[PDB]
């Protein structure tokens, strides 16, 4: 009450922005802030003198430069790249016939957070995460698994080690914060899509050599190893080429799981196809079976995107209805897309 109208004069009139640096163990905090100006603050209010911690920012008086208050300021590229939020509307009921694959990871997506008891009733402690892979280009069908995992906890998806390869290290460090800001958001989940590290070779901008890119992946696991980190952030990882990864990534984690993605079979293509054309009204002669029955070795993306070609001409005529006379004939274009392209 009166304290608010008392210390406002000590605060007053303005107060600067400092950078919290180091402490005399007597709690006289030596700071380097522009330009390299120090101070000694043992002040009684608002602290929490400990946790403000080295390597932070402070707010200093003019006379004389005592930090009377502190903030946590981001923004920054740190928090921005993790979020927000999202939970897109797709579900794990979208992909059928592979339930054998997701019912495996079902307990892996379920047991952390939801339904935790029989983890600790067994007490065997399986919090080892997951690894993913499959042909040819997959992992958005695993995003169709990941879009379902958005029903629980919180999630971030990252792509590649690219943020390290943009320049000479720089270490892992942008991965480090992304790893330890998931501790700030713990419990959470983090996934890196299709690790290209040594799978792809050349770099954008400037990078080298192999070992610094080798070790930034080696440190990626060794930080996640870790010494000694309980933090989850249940780690989801995927690459569609099992070759290039260093095989030692499996044993520390995830040890138990790397999902095998089977290519779609005849009835799986039938199970998958109608989910798309459910919304797009087919004409009388349009049939799901015969087309995909004759066609072989398709992809869920194509069998989803084969409906888009009819979404051109029928929409060029501005028609709500698909026509198989086109959908047959237009399929040649997507057939030409796979054949010649």
């Amino acid at each position: 009450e009166e304290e608010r109208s008392k210390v406002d004069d000590l605060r007053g009139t303005p107060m600067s922005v400092g950078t919290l640096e180091e402490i005399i163990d007597d709690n006289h905090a030596i700071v380097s802030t522009s330009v390299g100006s120090e101070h000694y603050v043992s002040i009684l209010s608002f602290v929490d003198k400990d946790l403000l911690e080295p390597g932070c920012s402070v707010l200093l008086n003019h006379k004389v430069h005592a930090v009377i208050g502190v903030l946590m300021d981001d923004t920054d590229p740190l928090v921005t790249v993790m979020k927000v939020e999202k939970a897109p509307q797709e579900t794990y009921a979208d992909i059928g016939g592979l339930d054998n694959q997701i019912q495996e990871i079902k307990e892996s997506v379920e047991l952390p957070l939801t339904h935790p008891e029989y983890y600790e009733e067994m007490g065997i402690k399986p919090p080892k995460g997951v690894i993913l892979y499959g042909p040819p280009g997959t992992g958005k069908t695993l995003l169709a698994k990941a879009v379902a995992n958005q029903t629980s906890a919180t999630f971030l998806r990252v792509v590649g080690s690219e943020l390290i390869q943009k320049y000479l290290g720089d270490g892992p460090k942008l991965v480090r914060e992304l790893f330890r800001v998931a501790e700030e958001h713990a419990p959470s989940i983090v996934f890196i899509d299709e690790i290209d590290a040594i799978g792809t070779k050349r770099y954008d901008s400037n990078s080298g050599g192999e070992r610094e890119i080798q070790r930034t992946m080696l440190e990626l696991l060794n930080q996640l190893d870790g010494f000694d980190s309980r933090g989850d952030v249940k780690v989801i990882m995927a690459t569609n080429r099992i070759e290039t990864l260093d095989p030692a990534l499996i044993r520390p984690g995830r040890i138990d799981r790397k999902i095998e993605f089977p290519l779609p079979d005849e009835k799986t293509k039938k199970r998958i196809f109608q989910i798309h054309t459910s919304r797009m009204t087919l004409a009388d002669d349009v049939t799901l079976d015969d087309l995909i029955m004759a066609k072989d070795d398709l992809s869920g993306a194509d069998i989803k995107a084969i409906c888009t070609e009819a979404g051109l001409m029928a929409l060029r005529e501005r028609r709500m209805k698909v026509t198989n006379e086109d959908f047959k004939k237009s399929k040649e274009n997507v057939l030409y897309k796979k054949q010649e392209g």
């Binding site: 957070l113 935790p116 008891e117 600790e120």
Partner: protein, 689 residues
Amino acid sequence: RDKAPVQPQQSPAAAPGGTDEKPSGKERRDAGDKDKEQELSEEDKQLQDELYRPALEELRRQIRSSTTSMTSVPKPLKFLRPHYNKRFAADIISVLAMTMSGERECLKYRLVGAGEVAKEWQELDDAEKVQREPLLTLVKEIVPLLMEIEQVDMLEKDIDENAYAKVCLYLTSCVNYVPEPENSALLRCALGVFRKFSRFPEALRLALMLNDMELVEDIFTSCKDVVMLGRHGVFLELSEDVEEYEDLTEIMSNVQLNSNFLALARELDIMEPKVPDDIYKTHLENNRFGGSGSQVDSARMNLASSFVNGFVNQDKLLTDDGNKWLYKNKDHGMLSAAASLGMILLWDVDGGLTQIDKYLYSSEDYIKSGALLACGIVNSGVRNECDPALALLSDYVLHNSNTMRLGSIFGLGLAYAGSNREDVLTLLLPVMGDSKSSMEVAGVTALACGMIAVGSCNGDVTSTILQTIMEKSETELKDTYARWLPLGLGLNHLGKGEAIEAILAALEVVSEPFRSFANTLVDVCAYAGSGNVLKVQQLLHICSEHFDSKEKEEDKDKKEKKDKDKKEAPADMGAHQGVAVLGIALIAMGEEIGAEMALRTFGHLLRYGEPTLRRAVPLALALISVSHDADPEVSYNSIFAARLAAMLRQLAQYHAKKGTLTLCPYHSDRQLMSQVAVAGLLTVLVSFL
């Protein structure tokens, strides 16, 4: 084509050019015209012109319906009397007749109060029976009983779309947004079409919202016609209130047709399959008896532990665990432990007498009175435990049998729910006329006669609770009386659909804020919950009242009111400062399955310093979850390590391990900041199987 040949046709006024141009415009009316109908500014002059002038009404409603109007648009259709599966039929019928007839039904539904809109409404009903996509046509045709003949007119073939889709969205949205009186039309015409249909728990949830006595006779001749069976006896007895199993056992005491509905649908057969199968498929170990039953000693925590051990139910082992544990125990905890053998065994009718019989008529008043309390706990269909207690009850001021009156009036309140049992209430007239200084005499009087009286026929203002109003306002002493008598008052107010009893007790009762707190208790209990937000903004204003206990119960009504639309139930009560309000939200989470947002609110509510609120958190905290579960428990061990807090922790451990029967006893618990004599009745919130 261009509008050059067809556009100056509106300029002549000769009849043949109109009577062939309008069929020519009918062929192009499949897309209306080439475009957005910019004939309007030239053909609106043609209004005053008068053979095929109803075709001119079709053109006029076509173009006015084509651009925009709210009342002049359906006027050519009500003047037209529509005459003379298609794309054009989807146009002039579906979007134009749906939106146009919708604004005519809204504008005349709010305006006048004809048969023309009834004929158009049945015609659009038939046309959307042709279109066969319900959901939107249904929710449009609610707001014009009309909906009755709509349902029996519509229901021939499709069962689960109308039933599941219509009755789901319109049951949920009808209790959610719609006021009460049309829900009766939902329930009665849904009784018609579900009376036509099978899968009878739709009609049993109609018995949940209706509370009708003809329905259970129809569903027992029909659910005996469909011979699982004891399982619908189980959720029959769970689903039913206090009235209709006694009306059911009297009219089925007359007829019964196999006597197996007298077996099932009164008592003892919801409970005969469970307890052996409870022993069979479950296998519960001993290290929580010993470990959770080891949590130290102090005749409180230890006393509570006896209760915790007692509510364990793998056999009635903690019942028969020796002696010297109840001899360490003291008076109201001796009530709790004498009733605890009731709590281990809410079955074993023959075993109940032969286990409690040692503690019956013993040397101690609390052993015998809590023993008859246990007899009231174990069952609800015996009624032969009444007379050994019933005979003794009279003491005329404050002798022994008034404590047997507390356990036996309360336990007999546990025992029966008749049409109106009157003999036990004629016993209750020398109880309130007795008026012992012990609170729970009038406490279990009001609460027990309320358990008899919950589900009354729109309540009653009868001389029972009228008598306890007048004999309540007789003595202004020990304000727990002024709190727990409006408990049973509002319990007799339960069963309402439309009761003016808040106005009646408002005229009789209101005064200085003891009886204005009675006013807010009747205001709570008379208003179970609907789309009735006017009392929620009344809640907003009188929530700011300076008397801070009508705040407690009046804001505490929220978990009764908005229990179904529970996404709005997160409120900023923690962001307020009237600490009992944080208690109110702390109640308002409660016991259901308890999502991560609720436990997230227990993140802050777990950490508080006042021992009644830190006491108040583990109770609903472990009710809402009936490591993970034990993680906040060991977190409470991190909180304290007072004695209250230890007791609260024990209660939380016990918790760890609109049916009115689960609605009463925690509002009975809402005065917890008190003596252990009050906590001698704390073990009478019997809301779990």
